[PDB]
Design a protein around this ligand. Structure first.
Ligand code: MG
Ligand code: MG
Ligand code: MG
Ligand code: MG
Ligand code: MG
Ligand code: MG
Ligand code: ZN
Ligand code: ZN
Ligand code: ZN
Lengths: 56, 144, 178, 37, 220, 129, 63
RNA sequence: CCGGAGUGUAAAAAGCUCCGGGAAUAAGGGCUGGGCAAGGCCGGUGGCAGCCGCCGCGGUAAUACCGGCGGCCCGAGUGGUGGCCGCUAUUAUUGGGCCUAAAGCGUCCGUAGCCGGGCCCGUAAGUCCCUGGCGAAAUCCCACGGCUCAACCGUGGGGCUUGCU
RNA sequence: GCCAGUGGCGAAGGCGCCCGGCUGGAACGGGUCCGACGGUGAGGGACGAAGGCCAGGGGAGCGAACCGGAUUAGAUACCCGGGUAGUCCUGGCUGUAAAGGAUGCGGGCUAGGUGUCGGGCGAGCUUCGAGCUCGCCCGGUGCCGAAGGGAAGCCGUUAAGCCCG
C-alpha cells in the first residue's frame, strides 16, 4: 500500500482534496513539512522534526 | 439553552413536560378525549345503512367544472342525515328514493372529503343489498 | 391476548421496485417457482439465519456459544456450509443457496427430471422418494445426508426403465447449476 | 388579549387593531345581553 | 488509457506528468493540494470511469430564468461517476440542452473525484474486509444531515436511491443511514452523502485499527 | 454557574483539537480529571499531562497529539452493568472497539474494556474517540 | 502560560522610611487607608484609586 | 375430479394404503399520467359524463373518463372503508425546535423542586460484583425428535414477567 | 433647545437647565474579610410606557369626540379654523405595548482587528491643567472579520458555535 501524509502541526492525516501544502524544511532540508488547510488558514505554527526551525 | 431537566433525578418533571406537550399533539387529543366518537354520525363504524331521502348534485370547487351526483341519506342507528356520493356513471339513475343504501367513507385525507367534491365525506357502496359497481357495470340488477 | 399464528414469510417494503422485480423474476424463472410467497419464504429463512449470526457475533458466552454451535451444525446438516465454517460464512450465504437446497432443484439435478417444472410435477404426483419416504412438497429443504438417497418411488412408472419419460430424461443426463 | 404577529401582517388580512375592536364590540354586546338584558 | 491518451494534449502540469508516464496512480494524484482541471487525467488513471455503467445521472431539473420576452430555461444535471472500488465523484452541469448538461456534469464529476476509506466497523460483522465504511461518519449540505453507519455484510444499502447510487460507485456494499432534513432535495442529499464519504478520511485512528477494521483507502 | 469541571475540560480539549492546538490548560483540576487523563494517555489520545499547583484547585497542562475527534462527558453518570457496554458503545462510539468509554468503578476509573475483562460495571462518566 | 496562569499581584510591598523619625517600615503600594508612621504619625502613603502616592521614602526598597 | 375396497372412527366422515377411469374438473382481483411496475394502440364522450388517497386529467388528436386489444402487480385471493403501529427527529430520554418560519413570561425578586467548586476522613443509602429464594404454565428464541416435511406437538437449553427479597 | 454622541446610568419601563440635601446600584484598585454562602425558579410577589377610570386641583400650547370651511363623484378623512376630554399636579386603580436585541438567565472553551466610555498601570509631552498622546489590564458599548455556524439573510469571544445546567 501507500502511506497517507500527516501535518507537522496537527498530526491529522491530510485528506484528498484539502488545500494543503508540502515543502522541504528551510534551514534543514531533508524533511518534508506537510501543512493542512486549517493550519495554514489559522496561522498554526509548525516546527521541523529534524531541526527545530519553527515557521508559520 | 440546554433542554429542561436533564438531571439524573429529574424524571418526574421530564415526564410531566412531555405529557403537557402531548396535549399539544392533536392526534393524541382526539384519540384520548374521543372527539371523533362524539361528533361522528356513523358512531365509530366503517360502514352504515341509510334511507335515501333525495338525490342531488354538487358543484366541483373552482377549476373543475362538473356536477357530482349525490344523495341525502338518513342513517338508521341515529336518525341522522348525511350526504353521500354515488360513484359511477349512471349510479344516480340506478338509485331511487326510500332505498336502503350502504355508506362507506369516501377516502380522503383525514377521514374526510376527497378531491374536487368539497364537503362530502361518504360513499355509497350497496343499494338494496346490491353493489353499485355491479349495478353500474350492468350485472346484478336491483331487487326493487 | 393470545398467540395468533403468524406468517413465516416477509413481504417487501415497497411492491414496485424495478431492481427487486427484475432480480426476482429471473430467480423465479430459473428455479420454477409458483409464488413470490415461496421465494420470500426462503429469503426469510436466510434472513433469520443472518440475524442469529449477527446477534451471536455481538454476544457473550455460556449461551450464544451453544447457539453458535447449533447454527453452524444446522447449516452443515442442511448443506449450506461446510463443517469448517463460521458466522462470517453465514453472512456470505444467499437465497440461491437455499433454493438450490430445495427438492425441486435437486431433482432437476440428480438427472431425475429434465426440467425444474417436470421435477415439480414428479414430486407432486408422487414419484420422488427421500430416504424411502415419499415427499410431495417441492419446497422441502433436503439435508446433505438425505441428498444421496433421492430416487424414484418404487411404486412409480418412472422407476421402470422402460418408461418413455424415464427414457427421455436419461437421454439427457445433465446436472450442475439448477 | 393573546395576540399573534402573524395576525398583525396584512398579506391577506384586515388590520388587527380593527379586528380586535370588532371582537370587543361583539363581546360587549354579548356581556350586555347576558347579565342584565 | 491509451485511447484517450493519444488524442489528449495535457494543458496542465499534472496532465503533462500523466502523459509523460509520471504519476501513474490516482493515489499519487490526490493528497498533495494538486489542481485537477482535466477529466482526461481522471480517465487515464481511472479508465473505468469512462463507462456508461459506472456513470450515473442522479437528477435532471429544468430551472427557469425570467426575462422580458418570457422564460429562458436551463437544465441542471446532477451526475456521479466512480470506480466501484473506492473512488467516486459528483458533479453538477448546466446547459440549454440535457445532453450538454450531462457531459459537463460528468466532466466536473471527474474533476471532483475523491478517495475514500472502506472497511468493516459494525459490531455484528467484524469481517476485516472492505464491504462497508469502517466507522460511522456524518455529512451535510443545506438542511440535509446524513449520518452513515457501518452495516453487516449482505445487509445492502439502507439509504435512499441517491445514496445507493453514490455508495455503489464508491464500492460500499452495506450501510445504515439516519437522515435529517429535506432529502427530496437531491443535490444536497447527494452532496451530504459525498461529504460523509470524505469525512471517512477526516476521521483519525490509532495504529491497530487499520488491521482490525480492514481499512482500505482505495483499491483493495 | 460552574458545574462539572470534567465536562468543561473535555469540551476544551475537543475545541482545541478542532483548531489544532498543541497544549491546553484545565483550570479547576480534580483527581477525576487526572484519572480520565491517565486513561486517555494510556489509550493514546493525548500525550503528556502535568499538574501545576497554584493556591487554588490546581491546573493541568495537557499536551495533545492530534488523536481526538470527539471527547465528552456522559453527564447523567449512567449506571451500567457488565453486560450493557454494547449498547452504550453503540450510542457513543462509531465502531465496535473504536474509542473509549471511561467508567468509574469501585475498583477505580477504567475503560469499558478493562471493566469487561474484570467483569465489573459501574458508572459512565465520559467518552473519547 | 502568561498573564492568566497563576494570576499574580501587580502590587508590591515596599520598605520606606519617614523623613521625620527615619524608621524603616514595610507598607503596601496599593493602600485603602492613609498609612501612618508607627512612631511619628506621619503619612507615608496617601490613598488613591490605585497605587498610593508615596511621601517619605527617600531611602526605599521593594520586595 | 369421478367410482370402489381396506384402515381409520364411539360410530361415521375426512385422512392414509390400494384398484379403475381419464388433461380431464379447476384463476381471478386490482392497476395501467406521476408518486408506482406496466400503452406515444384503437373506438366513444367532448368542462358534459366521469376519474382523482395527493398532484391532477377531461372544454374535438384525452396514453389520466367509458370500452376493446394489450400489458404490470399480487395470485386462491385481490381490492374498498374504518382503526392501531410505522412512516413522524410531526412529542424528540436516545433525538426536535423558539432573531426573521409556530414559539423567550414586559422586567426583576424569590418558595418548593432540580443542577451544583476543590481536598481529607468516615458511612455504605443509591451504584457495581457474587450468591440464596421467588417472579406459574402457555406464549418468545434455539437445537433435537414425532405426525410425509412444515405448520402443530414433545424433550432440553435460554429468555420474558417492572421485579421483589 | 444648541452642547448631545452607534455617548452614559438603570432589571426593564425609562432617565437630560442649574444648586443643595437624602438615597440605590455598578466598574476599577485591593497578599482585606466570610468561607460554597451558589444557579434556575413551578407556584407567589414587586416594579411596570402611553392611554383609560375614581376623587380633588389646575388648564398656556397641542388637541380624540364635536363644530365649521374646503376637497371630492362621494369624503363620516387626509388640508384649514376652532374645540371637549386629555395632556400637568396630588392620591389611588388599571397592569396592557413592534414592553423589540422580535435573541430567557448562569458558567467554561473556540483567531483577532479597529473604535469609544469608565477605572487602573507604565511611558512620553506639556501652556504643569480633574491636561494631551502612545501602549497594556479589567469591565462596558459598537463596527468589521478568518475559521465555524446557519434555509438563507445574517451571526460570528456582547454567537444565532461546542459543552454544562
Ligand atoms: Mg392513475
Ligand atoms: Mg404536528
Ligand atoms: Mg421541528
Ligand atoms: Mg415568529
Ligand atoms: Mg413462563
Ligand atoms: Mg459580518
Ligand atoms: Zn495541521
Ligand atoms: Zn529541517
Ligand atoms: Zn516617621
Amino acid at each position: 500500500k501507500f502511506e497517507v501524509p500527516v501535518c507537522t502541526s496537527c498530526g491529522k492525516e491530510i485528506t484528498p482534496r484539502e488545500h494543503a501544502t508540502h515543502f522541504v524544511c528551510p534551514n534543514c532540508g531533508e524533511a518534508i513539512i506537510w501543512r493542512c488547510e486549517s493550519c495554514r488558514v489559522l496561522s498554526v505554527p509548525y516546527k521541523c522534526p529534524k531541526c527545530g526551525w519553527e515557521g508559520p | 439553552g440546554k433542554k429542561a431537566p436533564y438531571g439524573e433525578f429529574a424524571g418526574r418533571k421530564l415526564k410531566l413536560k412531555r405529557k403537557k406537550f402531548r396535549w399539544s399533539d392533536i392526534r393524541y387529543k382526539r384519540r384520548v378525549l374521543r372527539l371523533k366518537e362524539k361528533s361522528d354520525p356513523l358512531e365509530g363504524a366503517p360502514q352504515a345503512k341509510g334511507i335515501v331521502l333525495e338525490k342531488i348534485a354538487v358543484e366541483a370547487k373552482q377549476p373543475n367544472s362538473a356536477m357530482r351526483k349525490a344523495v341525502r341519506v338518513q342513517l338508521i342507528k341515529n336518525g341522522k342525515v348525511v350526504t353521500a356520493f354515488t360513484p359511477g356513471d349512471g349510479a344516480i339513475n340506478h338509485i331511487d328514493e326510500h332505498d336502503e343504501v350502504i355508506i362507506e367513507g369516501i377516502g380522503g385525507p383525514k377521514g374526510g372529503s376527497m378531491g374536487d367534491i368539497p364537503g362530502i365525506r361518504y360513499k355509497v357502496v350497496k343499494v338494496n343489498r346490491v353493489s353499485l359497481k355491479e349495478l353500474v357495470k350492468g350485472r346484478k340488477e336491483k331487487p326493487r | 391476548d393470545p398467540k395468533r399464528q403468524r406468517k413465516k414469510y416477509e413481504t417487501p417494503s415497497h411492491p414496485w421496485i424495478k431492481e427487486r422485480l427484475d432480480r426476482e423474476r429471473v430467480i423465479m424463472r430459473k428455479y420454477a417457482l409458483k409464488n413470490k410467497k415461496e421465494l420470500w419464504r426462503h429469503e426469510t429463512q436466510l434472513k433469520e439465519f443472518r440475524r442469529r449470526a449477527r446477534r451471536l457475533l455481538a454476544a457473550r458466552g455460556k449461551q450464544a456459544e451453544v447457539e453458535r454451535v447449533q447454527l453452524l451444525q444446522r447449516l452443515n446438516r442442511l448443506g449450506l456450509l461446510p463443517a469448517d465454517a463460521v458466522l462470517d460464512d453465514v453472512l456470505s450465504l444467499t437465497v440461491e443457496d437455499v433454493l438450490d437446497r430445495r427438492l425441486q432443484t435437486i431433482v432437476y439435478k440428480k438427472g431425475l427430471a429434465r426440467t425444474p417444472r417436470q421435477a415439480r410435477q414428479l414430486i407432486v404426483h408422487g414419484h420422488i422418494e427421500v430416504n424411502g419416504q415419499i415427499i410431495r412438497s417441492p419446497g422441502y429443504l433436503v439435508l446433505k445426508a438425505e441428498e444421496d438417497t433421492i430416487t424414484y418411488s418404487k411404486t412409480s412408472p418412472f422407476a421402470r426403465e422402460s418408461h418413455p419419460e424415464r427414457m427421455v430424461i436419461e437421454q439427457a443426463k445433465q446436472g450442475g447449476e439448477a | 388579549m393573546k395576540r399573534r404577529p402573524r395576525k398583525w401582517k396584512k398579506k391577506g388580512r384586515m388590520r388587527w387593531k380593527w379586528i380586535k375592536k370588532r371582537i370587543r364590540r361583539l363581546k360587549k354586546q354579548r356581556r350586555k345581553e347576558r347579565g342584565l338584558i | 488509457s491509451q485511447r484517450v491518451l493519444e488524442e489528449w494534449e495535457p494543458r496542465t502540469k499534472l496532465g503533462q506528468l500523466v502523459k509523460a508516464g509520471q504519476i501513474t496512480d490516482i493515489h499519487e494524484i490526490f493528497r498533495k493540494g494538486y489542481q485537477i482541471k482535466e477529466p482526461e487525467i481522471v480517465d487515464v488513471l481511472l479508465p473505468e470511469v469512462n463507462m456508461r455503467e459506472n456513470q450515473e445521472v442522479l437528477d435532471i431539473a429544468l430551472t427557469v430564468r425570467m426575462t422580458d420576452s418570457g422564460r429562458r430555461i436551463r437544465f441542471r444535471v446532477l451526475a456521479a461517476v466512480g470506480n466501484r472500488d473506492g473512488y467516486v465523484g459528483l458533479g453538477i452541469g448546466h446547459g440549454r440542452e440535457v445532453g450538454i448538461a450531462i457531459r459537463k456534469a460528468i466532466n466536473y464529476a471527474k474533476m471532483n473525484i475523491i478517495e475514500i476509506k472502506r472497511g468493516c466497523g459494525s459490531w455484528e460483522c467484524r469481517c476485516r474486509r472492505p464491504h462497508s465504511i469502517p466507522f460511522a461518519v456524518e455529512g451535510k449540505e443545506g438542511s440535509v444531515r446524513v449520518k452513515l453507519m457501518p452495516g453487516p455484510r449482505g445487509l445492502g444499502l439502507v439509504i435512499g436511491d441517491v445514496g445507493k447510487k453514490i455508495l455503489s460507485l464508491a464500492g460500499v456494499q452495506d450501510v445504515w443511514s439516519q437522515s435529517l432534513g429535506e432529502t427530496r432535495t437531491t443535490v444536497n442529499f447527494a452532496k451530504a452523502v459525498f461529504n460523509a464519504l470524505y469525512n471517512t478520511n477526516r476521521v483519525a485512528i490509532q495504529p491497530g485499527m487499520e488491521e482490525k477494521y480492514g481499512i482500505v483507502v482505495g483499491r483493495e | 454557574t460552574l458545574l462539572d469541571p470534567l465536562a468543561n475540560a473535555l469540551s476544551h480539549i475537543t475545541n482545541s483539537e478542532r483548531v489544532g492546538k498543541k497544549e491546553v490548560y484545565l483550570k479547576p483540576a480534580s483527581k477525576l480529571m487526572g484519572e480520565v487523563l491517565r486513561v486517555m494517555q494510556e489509550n493514546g489520545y493525548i500525550g503528556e499531562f502535568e499538574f501545576i499547583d497554584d493556591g487554588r484547585a490546581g491546573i493541568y497542562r495537557v499536551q495533545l497529539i492530534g488523536k481526538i475527534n470527539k471527547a465528552g462527558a456522559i453527564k447523567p453518570r449512567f449506571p451500567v452493568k457488565a453486560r450493557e457496554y454494547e449498547a452504550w458503545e453503540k450510542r457513543f462510539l462509531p465502531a465496535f472497539e473504536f474509542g473509549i468509554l471511561i467508567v468509574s468503578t469501585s475498583q477505580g476509573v477504567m475503560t469499558h474494556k478493562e471493566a469487561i475483562e474484570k467483569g465489573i460495571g459501574g458508572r459512565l462518566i465520559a467518552y473519547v474517540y | 502560560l502568561p498573564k492568566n496562569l497563576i494570576p499574580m499581584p501587580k502590587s508590591r510591598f515596599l520598605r520606606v522610611k519617614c523623613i521625620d523619625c527615619g524608621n524603616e517600615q514595610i507598607v503596601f503600594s496599593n493602600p485603602s487607608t492613609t498609612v501612618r508612621c508607627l512612631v511619628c504619625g506621619a503619612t507615608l502613603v496617601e490613598p488613591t484609586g490605585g497605587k498610593g502616592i508615596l511621601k517619605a521614602k527617600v531611602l526605599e526598597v521593594l520586595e
